[PDB]
């Protein structure tokens, strides 16, 4: 099926998935200089407090990080959303080089993994239905680059042994995902999509300005990874990115000046 291959890569995702081609997919560029202040623009509110960690699981694209969503726990309000989203799964993506990985790029730059923490309108009752909105879903990314450690990622880094391949999950109680945000909650915002099949057009894109820094050792162990199942020839999980979309007819809107 689909995946990040030269056989069943981005450039062939349409054929199953149409939408691929659509008006408003992610990611896309930042260009920094053409986005603009928003002074309505409320700042982000992230309450991680709370929050329930569950399982960490290998799908064959990237690892997710899963959370009990059954109850307001963790979530991500104000900036620009009207409402309640709830923490669902954090994930990555990453290169097989420091210089690339990221699917945002800011003026062109490609940072080595970009972070997503994927949250889903409460108003519509289960990220199934939220899915198939145009408001569904707020996913708030986060760079990482290669510099010193996050020791708020060592956590998910030693685990990753454990879920080296497809299908495999681990027990991933009480993490608190609080230990990987940066400083900073200034951020560039635009209406888009899912960076992966199925590509729906249902979210509201939160990019963070402030990168992360993580170590060369850390995301080395990301690269261990396999996007094979148990028992397949091995094919290292690395560049599981999707390239920068045409940005049409939208507009990226700053919170900062
Ligand atoms: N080599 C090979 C064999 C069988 C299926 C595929 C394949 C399957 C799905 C897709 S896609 N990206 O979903 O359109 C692209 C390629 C590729
Ligand atoms: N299979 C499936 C079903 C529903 C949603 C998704 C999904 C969710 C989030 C993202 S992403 N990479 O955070 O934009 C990409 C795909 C994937
Ligand atoms: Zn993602």
Redesign the pocket.
């Known amino acids: 099926?689909?995946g990040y291959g030269k056989?069943?890569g981005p450039e062939?995702?349409?054929?199953?998935?149409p939408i691929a081609k659509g008006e408003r997919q992610s990611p896309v560029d930042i260009d920094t200089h053409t986005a603009k202040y928003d002074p309505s623009l409320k700042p982000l509110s992230v309450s991680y407090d709370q929050a329930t960690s569950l399982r960490i699981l290998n799908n064959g694209h990237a690892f997710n990080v899963e959370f009990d969503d059954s109850q307001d726990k963790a979530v991500l309000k104000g900036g620009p959303l009207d409402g309640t989203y709830r923490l669902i799964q954090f994930h990555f993506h990453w290169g097989s080089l420091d210089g690339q990985g990221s699917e945002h790029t800011v003026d062109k730059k490609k940072y080595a993994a970009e972070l997503h923490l994927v949250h889903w309108n409460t108003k519509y009752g289960d990220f199934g239905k939220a899915v198939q909105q145009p408001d569904g879903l707020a996913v708030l990314g986060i760079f990482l680059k290669v510099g010193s450690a996050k020791p708020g990622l060592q956590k998910v880094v030693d685990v990753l042994d454990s879920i080296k391949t497809k299908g495999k999950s681990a027990d991933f109680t009480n993490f608190d995902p609080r230990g990987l945000l940066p400083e900073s909650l200034d951020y560039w915002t635009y209406p888009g999509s899912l960076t992966t099949?199925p590509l729906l057009e249902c979210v509201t894109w939160i990019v963070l300005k402030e990168p992360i820094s993580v170590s060369s050792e850390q995301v080395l162990k990301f690269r261990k990874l396999n996007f094979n199942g148990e028992g397949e020839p091995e094919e290292l999980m690395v560049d599981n990115w999707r390239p920068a979309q045409p940005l049409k007819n939208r507009q990226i809107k700053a919170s900062f000046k």
């Open positions: 099926h689909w056989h069943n062939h995702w349409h054929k199953d998935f099949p």
